[PDB]
Amino acid sequence: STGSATTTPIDSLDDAYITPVQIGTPAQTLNLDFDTGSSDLWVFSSETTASEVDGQTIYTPSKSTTAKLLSGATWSISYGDGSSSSGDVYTDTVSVGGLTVTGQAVESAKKVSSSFTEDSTIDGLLGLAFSTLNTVSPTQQKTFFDNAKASLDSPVFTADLGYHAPGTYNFGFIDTTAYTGSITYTAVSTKQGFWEWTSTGYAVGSGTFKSTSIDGIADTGTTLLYLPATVVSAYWAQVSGAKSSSSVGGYVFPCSATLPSFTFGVGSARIVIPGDYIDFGPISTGSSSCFGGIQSSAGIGINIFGDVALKAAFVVFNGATTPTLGFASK
Numbered sequence: 001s002t003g004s005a006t007t008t009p010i011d012s013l014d015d016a017y018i019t020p021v022q023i024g025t026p027a028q029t030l031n032l033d034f035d036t037g038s039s040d041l042w043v044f045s046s047e048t049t050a051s052e053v054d055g056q057t058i059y060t061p062s063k064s065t066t067a068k069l070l071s072g073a074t075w076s077i078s079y080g081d082g083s084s085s086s087g088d089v090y091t092d093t094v095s096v097g098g099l100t101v102t103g104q105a106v107e108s109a110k111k112v113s114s115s116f117t118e119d120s121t122i123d124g125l126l127g128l129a130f131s132t133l134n135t136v137s138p139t140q141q142k143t144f145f146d147n148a149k150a151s152l153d154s155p156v157f158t159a160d161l162g163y164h165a166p167g168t169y170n171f172g173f174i175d176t177t178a179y180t181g182s183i184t185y186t187a188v189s190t191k192q193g194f195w196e197w198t199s200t201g202y203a204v205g206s207g208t209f210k211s212t213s214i215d216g217i218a219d220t221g222t223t224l225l226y227l228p229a230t231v232v233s234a235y236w237a238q239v240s241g242a243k244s245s246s247s248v249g250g251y252v253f254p255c256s257a258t259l260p261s262f263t264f265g266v267g268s269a270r271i272v273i274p275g276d277y278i279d280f281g282p283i284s285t286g287s288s289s290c291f292g293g294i295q296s297s298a299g300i301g302i303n304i305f306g307d308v309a310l311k312a313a314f315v316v317f318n319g320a321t322t323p324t325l326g327f328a329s330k
């Protein structure tokens with residue numbers, strides 16, 4: 001089997017991408033953020049504290065004939081940006097783009113943090129990291145991909161995110177029309193539960209490529225590209241007037257600037273991020289100071305190849321016995 005679904009930016013800046021997901025019988029369609037940085041499939045629900053719901057579409061398990069409460073199971077997660085959610089667990093039928101999993105763990109939120117309430121466009125998350133990170137207690141649950149994998153034509157999914165435009169998530173096949181050149185594959189470490197790999201280096205604009213190992217994760221649920229302070233300083237030094245702002249909490253630049261591209265290495269191959277992908281707009285409405293899309297990872301502890309980087313590539317998440325990651329230009 002296979003599946004294919006379109007993913008859409010939630011706003012004009014590509015802060016995040018949402019993908020429609022069918023849950024239950026009859027189907028309830030929710031727009032979820034596909035997140036290769038976590039391993040929980042959770043949704044706004046009829047059980048969510050009503051004052052914490054403000055415009056989201058909710059899952060009502062009582063209206064699904066295939067939903068079953070998973071007795072005694074609960075979940076609770078905290079994300080890198082400080083947001084969080086928690087609740088109880090159902091098993092139900094879940095379909096993505098024509099690919100169906102029966103008996104998927106659907107984590108129903110009883111509580112969400114203010115940042116979730118305040119964002120009406122994201123109805124929940126679909127985690128695509130390794131199932132060792134799943135937070136359900138006392139019996140850890142498998143991800144959508146792990147459940148689907150043996151049925152798939154090939155044990156893979158691909159991410160093809162758009163710049164200021166929709167893109168595609170595919171399951172079980174590689175669309176050879178969706179990229180240029182060849183796919184370069186690179187090793188993955190699963191020891192931390194992530195799609196962790198090592199980039200071979202970087203270049204700024206038309207500059208010389210610097211060969212250096214940069215360990216990081218491929219993370220569709222993070223907006224920005226977080227890299228070592230040395231690399232980040234080298235980038236923003238090429239932008240007149242850019243600076244690290246204490247009050248904003250990262251690099252800002254004049255909205256009148258033209259930004260250089262950023263290149264990262266995948267083995268002997270190279271992925272080029274155009275400069276406009278690195279512009280996230282005014283820091284506050286009406287400001288002439290704009291937020292940068294490349295930021296330091298120093299306060300985070302790991303480098304993160306978030307959407308700014310991934311949307312420049314066609315990315316293969318190969319879930320074979322020994323996982324690998326593939327990157328192609330497009």
Ligand SMILES: CC(C)(C)S(=O)(=O)N[C@@H](Cc1ccccc1)C(=O)N[C@@H](Cc1c[nH]c[nH+]1)C(=O)N[C@@H](CC1CCCCC1)C(O)(O)C(F)(F)C(=O)NCCN1CCOCC1
Binds near residue numbers: 036079224
């Ligand atoms: C505005 C922004 C300054 C650019 S922001 O950073 O707030 N944007 C958010 C994404 C966003 C956009 C729009 C609306 C809502 C949220 C962002 O990029 N958040 C990252 C920031 C980050 C990364 N690393 C450190 N900080 C994040 O937490 N991403 C997680 C998923 C997000 C959470 C908020 C809602 C959207 C999905 C994440 O899963 O990718 C993760 F990998 F960082 C993460 O937290 N992984 C959790 C892993 N735990 C390990 C222990 O076992 C349980 C699993």
